[PDB]
From a paper:
We first designed a soluble base construct (gB Base) comprising the HCMV gB ectodomain (Towne strain, residues 1 to 704) followed by a C-terminal T4 fibritin (foldon) trimerization motif, an octa-histidine tag, and a Twin-Strep affinity tag. We also substituted an unpaired cysteine at position 246 for serine (C246S) and eliminated the furin cleavage site with two serine substitutions (R457S, R460S). To structurally characterize the base construct, we determined a 3.4 Å resolution cryo-EM structure of gB Base in complex with the fragments of antigen binding (Fabs) from high affinity, neutralizing antibodies 1G2 and 7H3 (32, 38). As expected, the structure revealed that gB Base adopts the postfusion conformation and closely resembles previously determined crystal and cryo-EM structures of postfusion HCMV gB. Complexes of the gB Base construct with 1G2 and 7H3 yielded 2D class averages consistent with gB in the postfusion conformation bound to three 1G2 Fabs and either zero, one, or two 7H3 Fabs. Unlike gB-C7, which exhibits full 1G2 and 7H3 Fab occupancy in the 2.8 Å cryo-EM structure, 7H3 Fab bound to only one of the three protomers of gB Base. Comparison between occupied and unoccupied protomers reveals that 7H3 Fab displaces a flexible loop between DII and DIII (residues 466 to 475) that localizes to the apex in prefusion gB and the trunk in postfusion gB. When 7H3 is not bound, 10 additional residues of this DII/DIII loop are resolved, packing against the unoccupied 7H3 epitope. Our structural studies suggest that 7H3 and the DII/DIII loop compete to occupy a similar position in the postfusion conformation, explaining the partial occupancy of 7H3 Fab when complexed with gB Base observed by ns-EM and cryo-EM. This partial occupancy, which has not been recognized in binding studies or reported previously, occurred reproducibly in our structural studies and suggests that 7H3 occupancy could be used to evaluate the prefusion character of gB proteins.
Residue numbers in the entry:
A (entry chain C): 466 to 550
B (entry chain B): 345 to 441, 476 to 541
C (entry chain H): 1 to 9, 11 to 27, 27A, 27B, 28 to 95, 95A, 95B, 96 to 106
D (entry chain C): 640 to 693
E (entry chain K): 1 to 52, 52A, 53 to 82, 82A, 82B, 82C, 83 to 100, 100A, ...
F (entry chain A): 640 to 688
């Protein structure tokens, strides 16, 4: 698969390399930061889900309405909540 | 006085406050043009007008299927770098369905980053708001038990309040 | 839609600051400059801001400009007797492909 | 209206990055670049032609 | 100095035509666009249209379309606007304003765009009475 | 079982920035830059020779 030198002339200005370096560095840093943020968000959302589950035993209606952003009337019937009108 | 340099398809034009940006991923370059068009029926474009219009028609016939349709008329812009841009908008039909051009790449860098960031953070903001809304309701329910603790947490200062 | 709206009148006291607002749309002021014109009653209108904030030569430094998304603001400080005039905001609108003027913020000071 | 409402939102107003139109900066104009040479080929050839046609 | 001069006060009867002249000074007449604007005696400004001294093209709001004849005189550097079929709603002050948008770039001629009417004329009062 | 499960995972999926391989754009080739001059030194020296 090895090729052969094709005898092209070198570009004098050499700013294109610095521009590519700028783009690569910025892209890498942005991707790493957003990945970190997404992971922390996922962990916090898991904890908030557990909080929701525990608060369901008290007032299912308010919690389910907050989760679904709409009026939801639910009743507590043990380990499972029952939706109603 | 004008020679064909390169034809770019799927060019994205973005209207800024003062200039149009003709971003092109195939060239990886964005050309800035002042907002007033070059008069198409000019005496200096006579030797490239027919060629440019024919090339635009050929590209539209070849690289775009029946889903897309023409939009606007062929508009002539004079970029800040001296280049001349012939532009023909494309749109999806409804219910029918300087010797060194590094600067041109450099702009395409900024618009590629300034755009993406301005979306990324925005998503986060929206998500944040949603979470906060849910959290507020939590507070409300958890305000039924120990109002003082919830209020102290919210205001970051010791506050005593009963239910 | 593609119309400009500004308050019909404003007032104040000498030596104070008065702010004139100009509300636009997603077009015009949203993606275009906001030019500010002054018109002393009985005389021909004059230019006061030839960009978002930039001030032309000879215009007193008391006038300042600001742009925020869909709106623009002109701040007049000092508010002497010669600032009692109509203030029109204008912006090019691409949807109509036409300059647009407001209604007029008469300074009653 | 007598009761107050507890604002429980942690603000995250992030101002978007504003657009920037990069100038096409030109340090030395074409006139200075042409004037930067002691030996101007056009002038030399013009003087040689004048010598021939004299 | 950069300035515009307009004709004096004029009175016309409905159904007639009125001509307004705008003479430039202190700058090249064929470089910048010319905005024509109208304001009622007790109302705000109202854009009428734009004219290109270099090429002669012009465009006006639908209300004034068809009713306006635009001529130019490069030697005198004066633009003339003739309004026909006058109604009782055309009693107002007409202004001509030099735009900051050049009619031609370094190489090519440019179309119209709004870059601020930096220089304004003295204004011509036109009355339409019976 | 046959019970609905509350979907309370606020999705934050930020698509990563795709890589860009910047081209080395060539506006004027070497032939055009050599032909842009009225006076070519090599041709003049060949004629003198
Ligand atoms: C772009 O440039 C072209 C030509 O350089 C301009 O077109 C010219 O526009 C003027 C004004 O509309 C035309 O003059 C008028 O033409 C008709 C002919 O029927 C006549 O009714 C009038 O007496 C008047 O002379 C002119 O013919 C026309 N020329 C060409 C070759 O089309 C065009 O206006 C420029 N675009 C601008 C300034 O935005
Ligand atoms: C690099 O080039 C050399 C010389 O062409 C290659 O060496 C020979 O390559 C030929 C095919 O062109 C083979 O048939 C020979 O067996 C190779 N060896 C000798 C000793 O002649 C070499 O393989 C090339 N390298 C790569 C990585 O492709
Ligand atoms: C594009 O060019 C076409 C002509 O090829 C223009 O269509 C003319 O529009 C005017 C203005 O309404 C009509 O009076 C004419 O009848 C139309 N046809 C011709 C042949 O002149 C059109 O306006 C141009 N612009 C756009 C945006 O489509
Ligand atoms: C594109 O196709 C249309 C429709 O047949 C035709 O009129 C036009 O000439 C074509 N353009 C080309 C082949 O460049
Ligand atoms: C035409 O091209 C567009 C561009 O992506 C594509 O979405 C569309 O599916 C194409 N049309 C057909 C019929 O495949
Ligand atoms: C400059 O002075 C003016 C006086 O009108 C004032 O409005 C403005 O805020 C000052 N600038 C700054 C940056 O404080």
């Amino acid at each position: 698969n090895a090729t052969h030198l094709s005898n092209m002339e070198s570009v004098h200005n050499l700013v294109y390399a610095q521009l590519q370096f700028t783009y690569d560095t910025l892209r890498g840093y942005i991707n790493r930061a957003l990945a970190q943020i997404a992971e922390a968000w996922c962990v916090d959302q898991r904890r908030t889900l557990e909080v929701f589950k525990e608060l369901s035993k008290i007032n299912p209606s308010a919690i389910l309405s907050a989760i679904y952003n709409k009026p939801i009337a639910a009743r507590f019937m043990g380990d499972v909540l029952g939706l109603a009108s | 006085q004008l020679t064909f340099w390169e034809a770019s398809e799927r060019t994205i034009r973005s209207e800024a406050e003062d200039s149009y940006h003709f971003s092109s991923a195939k060239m990886t370059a964005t050309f800035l043009s002042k907002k007033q068009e070059v008069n198409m029926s000019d005496s200096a474009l006579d030797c490239v007008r027919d060629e440019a219009i024919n090339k635009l028609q050929q590209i539209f016939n070849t690289s775009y299927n029946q889903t897309y349709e023409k939009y606007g008329n062929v508009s002539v812009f004079e970029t800040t770098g001296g280049l001349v841009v012939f532009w023909q908008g494309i749109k999806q039909k409804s219910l029918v369905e300087v010797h060194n051009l590094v600067y041109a790449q450099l702009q395409f860098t900024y618009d590629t980053l300034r755009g993406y960031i301005n979306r990324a953070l925005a998503q986060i903001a929206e998500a944040w708001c949603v979470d906060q809304r849910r959290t507020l309701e939590v507070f409300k329910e958890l305000s039924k038990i120990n109002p003082s603790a919830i209020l102290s947490a919210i205001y970051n200062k010791p506050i005593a309040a009963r239910f | 839609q593609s119309v400009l709206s500004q308050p019909p009148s404003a007032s104040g006291t000498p030596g104070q600051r008065v702010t004139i607002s100009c509300s636009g749309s997603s077009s015009n002021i949203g993606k275009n400059y906001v030019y500010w014109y002054q018109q002393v009653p009985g005389t021909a209108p004059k230019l006061l801001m030839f960009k978002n904030n930039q001030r032309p030569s000879g215009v007193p430094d008391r006038f300042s400009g600001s742009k925020s998304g869909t709106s623009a603001s002109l701040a007049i400080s000092g508010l002497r007797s010669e600032d009692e005039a109509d203030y029109y905001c204008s912006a090019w609108d691409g949807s109509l492909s036409r300059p647009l003027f407001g209604g007029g913020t008469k300074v009653t000071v | 209206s007598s009761i107050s409402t507890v604002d429980s939102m942690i603000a995250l107003d992030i101002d978007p990055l504003e657009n920037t139109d990069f100038r096409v900066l030109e340090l030395y104009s074409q006139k200075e670049l042409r004037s930067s040479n002691v030996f101007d080929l056009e002038e030399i050839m013009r003087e040689f032609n004048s010598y021939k046609q004299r | 100095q950069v300035q515009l001069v307009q004709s004096g006060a004029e009175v016309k009867n409905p159904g007639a035509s009125v001509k307004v002249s705008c003479k430039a000074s202190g700058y090249t007449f064929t470089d910048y666009y010319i905005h024509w604007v109208r304001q009622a005696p007790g109302q705000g400004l109202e854009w009428m249209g734009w004219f290109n001294p270099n090429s002669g093209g012009t465009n006006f709001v639908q209300n004034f379309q068809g009713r306006v004849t635009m001529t130019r005189d490069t030697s005198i550097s004066t633009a003339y606007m003739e309004l026909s079929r006058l109604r009782s709603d055309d009693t107002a002050m007409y202004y001509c304003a030099k735009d900051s948008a050049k009619t031609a770039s370094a190489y090519y001629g440019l179309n119209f765009f709004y870059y601020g009417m930096d220089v304004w004329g003295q204004g011509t009062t036109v009355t339409v009475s019976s």
